[PDB]
Design an enzyme around this catalytic site. Structure first.
Site, PDB file in Angstrom:
ATOM      1  N   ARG A  35      45.978  47.149  -1.446  1.00  0.00           N
ATOM      2  CA  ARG A  35      45.990  47.111   0.014  1.00  0.00           C
ATOM      3  C   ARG A  35      47.383  46.947   0.587  1.00  0.00           C
ATOM      4  NH1 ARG A  35      40.648  43.417   1.645  1.00  0.00           N
ATOM      5  NH2 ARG A  35      39.167  45.175   1.651  1.00  0.00           N
ATOM      6  N   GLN A  40      44.750  51.472   2.121  1.00  0.00           N
ATOM      7  CA  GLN A  40      44.204  50.861   0.922  1.00  0.00           C
ATOM      8  C   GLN A  40      43.721  51.925  -0.045  1.00  0.00           C
ATOM      9  OE1 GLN A  40      40.739  48.513   2.117  1.00  0.00           O
ATOM     10  NE2 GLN A  40      40.402  49.868   3.872  1.00  0.00           N
ATOM     11  N   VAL A  41      43.704  51.579  -1.326  1.00  0.00           N
ATOM     12  CA  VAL A  41      43.010  52.387  -2.325  1.00  0.00           C
ATOM     13  C   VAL A  41      41.794  51.601  -2.786  1.00  0.00           C
ATOM     14  CG1 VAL A  41      43.150  53.492  -4.599  1.00  0.00           C
ATOM     15  CG2 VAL A  41      45.132  53.493  -3.068  1.00  0.00           C
ATOM     16  N   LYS A  61      42.062  56.776  -1.303  1.00  0.00           N
ATOM     17  CA  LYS A  61      42.994  56.223  -0.338  1.00  0.00           C
ATOM     18  C   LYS A  61      42.449  56.495   1.053  1.00  0.00           C
ATOM     19  CE  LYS A  61      47.374  56.327  -1.301  1.00  0.00           C
ATOM     20  NZ  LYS A  61      48.783  56.795  -1.485  1.00  0.00           N
ATOM     21  N   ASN A 169      54.345  52.240  -9.949  1.00  0.00           N
ATOM     22  CA  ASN A 169      53.743  53.499  -9.509  1.00  0.00           C
ATOM     23  C   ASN A 169      53.421  54.419 -10.678  1.00  0.00           C
ATOM     24  OD1 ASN A 169      53.440  53.400  -6.623  1.00  0.00           O
ATOM     25  ND2 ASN A 169      55.674  53.513  -6.426  1.00  0.00           N
ATOM     26  N   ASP A 182      51.634  57.270  -6.223  1.00  0.00           N
ATOM     27  CA  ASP A 182      52.329  56.479  -5.217  1.00  0.00           C
ATOM     28  C   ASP A 182      51.278  55.772  -4.370  1.00  0.00           C
ATOM     29  OD1 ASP A 182      54.315  55.405  -3.578  1.00  0.00           O
ATOM     30  OD2 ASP A 182      54.347  57.139  -2.246  1.00  0.00           O
TER      31      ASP A 182
HETATM   32  C1  LIG Z   1      50.371  60.328  -4.040  1.00  0.00           C
HETATM   33  N1  LIG Z   1      49.037  59.770  -3.863  1.00  0.00           N
HETATM   34  C2  LIG Z   1      48.444  58.931  -4.720  1.00  0.00           C
HETATM   35  O1  LIG Z   1      49.030  58.571  -5.755  1.00  0.00           O
HETATM   36  C3  LIG Z   1      47.057  58.443  -4.414  1.00  0.00           C
HETATM   37  C4  LIG Z   1      46.189  59.304  -3.649  1.00  0.00           C
HETATM   38  C5  LIG Z   1      44.863  58.919  -3.321  1.00  0.00           C
HETATM   39  C6  LIG Z   1      44.367  57.658  -3.750  1.00  0.00           C
HETATM   40  C7  LIG Z   1      45.206  56.793  -4.502  1.00  0.00           C
HETATM   41  C8  LIG Z   1      46.555  57.164  -4.847  1.00  0.00           C
HETATM   42  S1  LIG Z   1      47.534  56.043  -5.780  1.00  0.00           S
HETATM   43  C9  LIG Z   1      46.458  55.266  -6.910  1.00  0.00           C
HETATM   44  C10 LIG Z   1      46.445  53.828  -6.997  1.00  0.00           C
HETATM   45  C11 LIG Z   1      45.583  53.147  -7.920  1.00  0.00           C
HETATM   46  C12 LIG Z   1      44.728  53.943  -8.756  1.00  0.00           C
HETATM   47  C13 LIG Z   1      43.727  53.657  -9.806  1.00  0.00           C
HETATM   48  C14 LIG Z   1      43.264  52.354 -10.354  1.00  0.00           C
HETATM   49  C15 LIG Z   1      43.983  51.147 -10.359  1.00  0.00           C
HETATM   50  C16 LIG Z   1      43.502  49.850 -10.933  1.00  0.00           C
HETATM   51  C17 LIG Z   1      42.677  49.813 -12.114  1.00  0.00           C
HETATM   52  C18 LIG Z   1      42.261  48.545 -12.614  1.00  0.00           C
HETATM   53  C19 LIG Z   1      42.670  47.361 -11.934  1.00  0.00           C
HETATM   54  C20 LIG Z   1      43.485  47.493 -10.773  1.00  0.00           C
HETATM   55  N2  LIG Z   1      43.891  48.708 -10.286  1.00  0.00           N
HETATM   56  N3  LIG Z   1      43.260  54.782 -10.227  1.00  0.00           N
HETATM   57  N4  LIG Z   1      43.813  55.768  -9.603  1.00  0.00           N
HETATM   58  C21 LIG Z   1      44.739  55.330  -8.671  1.00  0.00           C
HETATM   59  C22 LIG Z   1      45.584  56.028  -7.768  1.00  0.00           C
END
Ligand SMILES: CNC(=O)c1ccccc1Sc1ccc2c(/C=C/c3ccccn3)n[nH]c2c1
Length: 304
Positions: A35, A40-41, A61, A169, A182
């Site tokens: 967040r 947030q994701v 996201k 990242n 990102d």
């Molecule tokens: C450039 N855009 C992106 O990277 C992006 C786009 C849409 C949604 C998210 C992101 S970034 C992102 C952040 C975390 C994640 C995760 C999982 C993370 C996690 C797994 C276990 C415990 C805590 N956190 N899977 N995929 C992800 C992608």
């Protein structure tokens, strides 16, 4: 706030809804994975998003309370650049989006079950040996390093740079695959000490090339500098760079003059030299990601 961007040095985005649009009612939202102030994701189950009739855990996201129309426009451009970039094993993979009126803009990408690489490595300090099932080894570290180099080489080939390349990242999923991402809006940079106040901006100074710090230039070769810092992060098992050093005007000064981090605890001699190559004061003297891919490839097979 988006750090993955088209390379200004390379300039001079449609939306194929029939391809990417995913029905909101086939998505069940779950817990937050990250967040920020305005974004947030969140973890979610997408039914049939990439395989017919199969439930799939995904990351989505979206914006949150406090966001405004301009964050909405920004997320849309994030969606568009992810479409432009296309698929690679080592960049987090776009699976779909919800863009219909009546609900939040949602950008859906693959879920990486182990989270960001920095946190993960820092949790394995007690479970590492250089050469015990589930223990990390030097081979993993070199392999993760090799993988990120490939993803960055790929991004370069799509004429993009990553303005915030760092272990926080990088994501780890199953089968020891790492993916560049990102968090962007879904990270609170005003609260994260990795971002230092400078002007109106909060910036990842410890990861930034001197020309970026002093001249505000972002090039793929400044990304190579950050990659060097990322290497240091990997071979410190998730330590914070420049340990116990105040990040101020004098830090930047000493950096421009040629002061570098000492070798991390888990590095090999070759890897540290590679870090040093990445931190060459002259951008044109740093290796390219292609050269890094080749070199880390050789270090990998050499190691095993
Ligand atoms: C450039 N855009 C992106 O990277 C992006 C786009 C849409 C949604 C998210 C992101 S970034 C992102 C952040 C975390 C994640 C995760 C999982 C993370 C996690 C797994 C276990 C415990 C805590 N956190 N899977 N995929 C992800 C992608």
């Amino acid at each position: 706030y988006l750090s993955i961007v088209m390379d200004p040095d390379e300039l001079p985005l449609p939306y194929d809804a029939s391809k990417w649009e995913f029905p909101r009612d086939r998505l069940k939202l779950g817990k937050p994975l990250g967040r920020g102030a305005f974004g947030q994701v969140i973890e979610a189950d997408a039914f049939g998003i990439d395989k017919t009739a199969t439930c799939r855990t995904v990351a989505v996201k979206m914006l949150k309370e406090g966001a405004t129309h301009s964050e909405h426009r920004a997320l849309m451009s994030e969606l568009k650049i992810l479409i432009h970039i296309g698929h690679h094993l080592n960049v987090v993979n776009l699976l779909g989006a919800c863009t219909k009126p009546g609900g939040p803009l949602m950008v859906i990408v693959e879920f990486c079950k182990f989270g960001n690489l920095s946190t993960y490595l820092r949790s394995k300090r007690n479970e590492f040996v250089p050469y015990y099932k589930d223990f990390l080894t030097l081979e993993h570290l070199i392999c993760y390093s090799f993988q990120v180099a490939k993803g960055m080489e790929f991004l370069a080939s799509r004429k993009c740079i990553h303005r915030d390349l760092a272990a926080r990242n990088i994501l780890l999923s199953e089968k020891n695959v790492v993916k560049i991402c990102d968090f962007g809006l879904a990270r609170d940079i005003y609260k994260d000490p990795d971002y230092v106040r400078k002007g109106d901006a909060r910036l990842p100074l410890k990861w930034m090339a001197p020309e970026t710090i002093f001249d505000r230039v972002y090039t793929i070769q400044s990304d190579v500098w950050s990659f060097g810092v990322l290497l240091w992060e990997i071979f410190s098992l998730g330590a914070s760079p420049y340990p116990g050093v105040k990040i101020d005007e004098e830090f930047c000064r000493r950096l421009k003059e040629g002061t570098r981090m000492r070798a991390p605890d888990y590095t090999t001699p070759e890897m540290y030299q590679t870090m040093l190559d990445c931190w060459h004061g002259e951008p044109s003297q740093r290796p390219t990601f292609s050269e890094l891919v080749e070199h880390l490839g050789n270090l990998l097979q050499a190691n095993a």
